[PDB]
Amino acid sequence: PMEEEEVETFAFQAEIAQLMSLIINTFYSNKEIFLRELISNSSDALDKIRYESLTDPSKLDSGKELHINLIPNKQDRTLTIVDTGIGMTKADLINNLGTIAKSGTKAFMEALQAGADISMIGQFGVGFYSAYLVAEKVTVITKHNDDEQYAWESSAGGSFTVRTDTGEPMGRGTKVILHLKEDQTEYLEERRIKEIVKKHSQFIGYPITLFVEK
């Protein structure tokens, strides 16, 4: 028999949609910083579970290992960044990834148009959206101790979907799946990934592991 699944489609907040259009429809050099930004977000999420767990070690019942895995797949043309940080409840997810104005959007767009390097994006708290420098679609899978596992996705166009996830369960954390644009396949190459992690993400305080396909 036919199966059913519930999907929730949301509109990006207006300024977030404009920031996405700017990122997507305009050339920036130095696109490589997308990875620094996502690793930074993972490192922060790992910090939040680590410190919470000091007071309450049962918060690590869903996994003690606090790390980041990078998983390129040339067949799928995806680069996946997995963390075991605090994760997001559904409400956290819709709050952090698009429905709520972010304090730094306006300010960041005026800087970028004014000629700022895209590299400045992390400082304005909208670093996630640098994913769209290199990805035509982003999927974000998340699991928080207080909620079920959810899948977020967007190909921009002003909207994103949320659903309960029917893929692999994770114990806790967030997985960002970048569906790369056809001209951005260098970010699936192990040499390039290592180069950019060395250059931008050296002082991250959790182990990071690159899985190379043989």
Ligand X SMILES: C[C@@H]1C[C@H]2O[C@@H]2/C=C\C=C\C(=O)Cc2c(Cl)c(O)cc(O)c2C(=O)O1
Annotated binding site for ATP: which residue ranges? 41, 83, 102, 128
**How many angstroms separate the CA atoms of 87 and 118, rounded?**
26
Binding of ligand X by 79 (CB under 6 A) = no
- CB nearer to ligand X: pick between 113 and 211: 211
Task: Write down the least CB distance from residue 3 to ligand X, Å.
Answer: 28
Q: Residue 153: which of 143, 164, 161 has the closest Cα?
A: 161
With CB under 6 A as the contact rule, the residue among 70, 135, 151, 176 that binds ligand X is 176
The DSSP code for 40 is H
What dihedral angle (degrees, nearest 10) is formed by the CA atoms of 60, 63, 64, 66? -110
Helix (H) or strand (E) holding 12: none
Q: In the complex, what is the shortest distance from the CB of residue 122 to ligand X, in angstroms, rounded to a whole number?
A: 10
Indicate the SS3 state at residue 82: strand
Stretch that binds ligand X, among 16-24, 37-45, 185-193, 194-202 (CB under 6 A): 37-45
Least separation in angstroms between residue 129's CB and ligand X is 9
The residue whose two tokens read 């970028």 is 112
Closest distance to ligand X from the beta carbon of 131 (Å): 8
Cβ-Cβ contacts under 8 Å for 179 (sequence gap 6 or more): 77, 78, 135, 136, 137, 138, 139
Q: Which helix (H) or strand (E) holds 70?
A: strand 68-73
Contact status: 92 vs ligand X (CB under 6 A):
yes
> Which amino acid makes up residue 60?
L
Q: Which is nearer to ligand X, 34 or 191 (CB)?
A: 34
User: Judged by CB, which is closer to ligand X: 44, or 61?
Assistant: 44
Single out the residue of 8, 14, 26, 48 in contact with ligand X (rule: CB under 6 A): 48
Q: Which residues are annotated as a binding site?
A: 41, 83, 102, 128
Total of chain residues touching ligand X, rule CB under 6 A: 18
* Binders of ligand X in range 114-153 (CB under 6 A): 128, 142
Please work out, in degrees rounded to the nearest 5, the angle formed at the alpha carbon of residue 127 by the alpha carbons of 77 and 72.
20
Q: What residues from 155 to 174 belong to the interface with ligand X (CB under 6 A)?
A: 174
Overall residue count recorded for the chain in this entry: 214
